[PDB]
């Protein structure tokens, strides 16, 4: 059963959650290759010299974290990621910190961001979109079972692996919470109405975000867009959404239910929970265990080149990894 799987998963998670791994590597053990992404921190392709394995290494500047008031969120991110284990999550292999920076070393996904492939091709076919959506459904089922809310769903945070399956990455806003929370965080296009209206909110905001994602994947643009976030928020709270003429009746109905301003009627947040989504007609052809097992053929598979090939990633300016001779923010990140 799923019940049976999730019960063991939670046992496994709980042990790691209460006794997090710490200081499992050092910077000098990795060769820095290429920056795969940057904002606020940055992610680099690196090579672990002792194995020759390639990984993606997230580097956070401790001082910058403090200034953005993201200390607790960063502590959440590392504690959660070292504890979880699921096929469609980027696995934390090592973590450490030095005088200046925090480091999280994860499994490398050479297929690049879904964002890149989605924007290029324009839009995905309903089957292509359904393939990805199912993996997000299963990942959220897993996360929510562990009382984890994710809060950062978008194509920019979904990596494609060499088999064409996805990895959900960026746990910067992930948090273990039973009951309601209040932090204003996320990405404008993906924010549930509760969040915009400074209400307390729960894991329903993740099922709403799934609605935005499926819509964007299938249409090629989000359901609520404008040049400024304010304008986007007005549309989200309006209570109106328009679907392209090419959207199937089943898709439109799924989305109306996921993109429901009314929490009592929003799929994923009803009495039956995630089964309302799983048993929808749009997922009728979905073999959920086959998705989990990865037996299903990927509708798109990234072009194989070398093991540390970066052509599915954009080019970013390469800045130094500077390490001060003085320890910064030791107290703040003691448990990291």
């Amino acid at each position: 059963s799923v019940k049976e799987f999730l019960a063991k998963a939670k046992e496994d998670f709980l042990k790691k959650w209460e006794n997090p791994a710490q200081n499992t590597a050092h910077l000098d053990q990795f060769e820095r290759i290429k920056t795969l992404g940057t904002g606020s921190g940055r992610v680099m392709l690196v090579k672990h010299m002792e194995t020759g394995n390639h990984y993606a290494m997230k580097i956070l500047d401790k001082q910058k974290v403090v200034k953005l008031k993201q200390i607790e969120h960063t502590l959440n991110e590392k504690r959660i990621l070292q504890a979880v284990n699921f096929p469609f999550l980027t696995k934390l292999e090592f973590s450490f910190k030095d005088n200046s920076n925090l480091y999280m070393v994860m499994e490398y996904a050479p297929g690049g961001e879904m964002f890149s492939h989605l924007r290029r091709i324009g839009r995905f076919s309903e089957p292509h979109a359904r393939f990805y959506a199912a993996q997000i459904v299963l990942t959220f089922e897993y996360l929510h079972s562990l009382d984890l809310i994710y809060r950062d769903l978008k194509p920019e945070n979904l990596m494609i692996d060499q088999q064409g399956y996805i990895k959900v990455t960026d746990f910067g806003f992930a948090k273990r919470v039973k009951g309601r929370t209040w932090t204003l965080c996320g990405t404008p296009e993906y924010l549930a109405p509760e969040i915009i209206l400074s209400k307390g909110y729960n894991k329903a905001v993740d099922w709403w975000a799934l609605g935005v994602l499926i819509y964007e994947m299938a249409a090629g643009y989000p359901p609520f867009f404008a040049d400024q976030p304010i304008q986007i928020y007005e549309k989200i709270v309006s209570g109106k959404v328009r679907f392209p003429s090419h959207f199937s009746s089943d898709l439109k109905d799924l989305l109306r239910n996921l993109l429901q301003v009314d929490l009592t009627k929003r799929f994923g947040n009803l009495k039956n929970g995630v089964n309302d989504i799983k048993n929808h007609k749009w997922f009728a052809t979905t073999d959920w265990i086959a998705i989990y097992q990865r037996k299903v053929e990927a509708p798109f598979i990234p072009k194989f080149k070398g093991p540390g090939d970066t052509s599915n990633f954009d080019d970013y300016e390469e800045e130094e990894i500077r390490v001060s001779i003085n320890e910064k923010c030791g107290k703040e990140f003691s448990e990291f």
Binding site: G39, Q70, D152, F173, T187, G220, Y221, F225, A226, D227
Partner: peptide
């Protein structure tokens, strides 16, 4: 078209997160 309006918008690139 809606597509045309999207592609002409300033929000077709990678979208930054927000926070207080």
């Amino acid at each position: 078209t809606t597509y045309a309006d999207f592609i002409a918008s300033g929000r077709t690139g990678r979208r930054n997160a927000i926070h207080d």
